[PDB]
């Protein structure tokens, strides 16, 4: 399914989407992406909208 990440960092903001087999897989991919881009924030996941957020 399609999962969305809302990036709400101090210096990196926006949205990205990926296909992933499940939310756990999307989470791993999005956390790795956030880490690689210097984002250190708090996370949420909403299963109704398939949306993750990371906020600094």
Curated annotation (Swiss-Prot):
| sequence repeat spans | 3-56
Question: Superkingdom of this entry's organism?
Answer: Bacteria
Cellular localisation: Secreted, Cell wall
Instruction: Report the protein name in the record.
Output: Immunoglobulin G-binding protein G
Taxonomic source organism: Streptococcus sp. group G
* The encoding gene: spg
């Amino acid at each position: 399914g399609q999962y969305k990440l809302i990036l709400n960092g101090k210096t990196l903001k926006g949205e990205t989407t990926t296909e992933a087999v499940d939310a756990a897989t999307a989470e791993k991919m999005f956390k790795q992406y956030a880490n690689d881009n210097g984002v250190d924030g708090e996370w949420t996941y909403d299963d109704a909208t398939k949306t993750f957020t990371v906020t600094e």
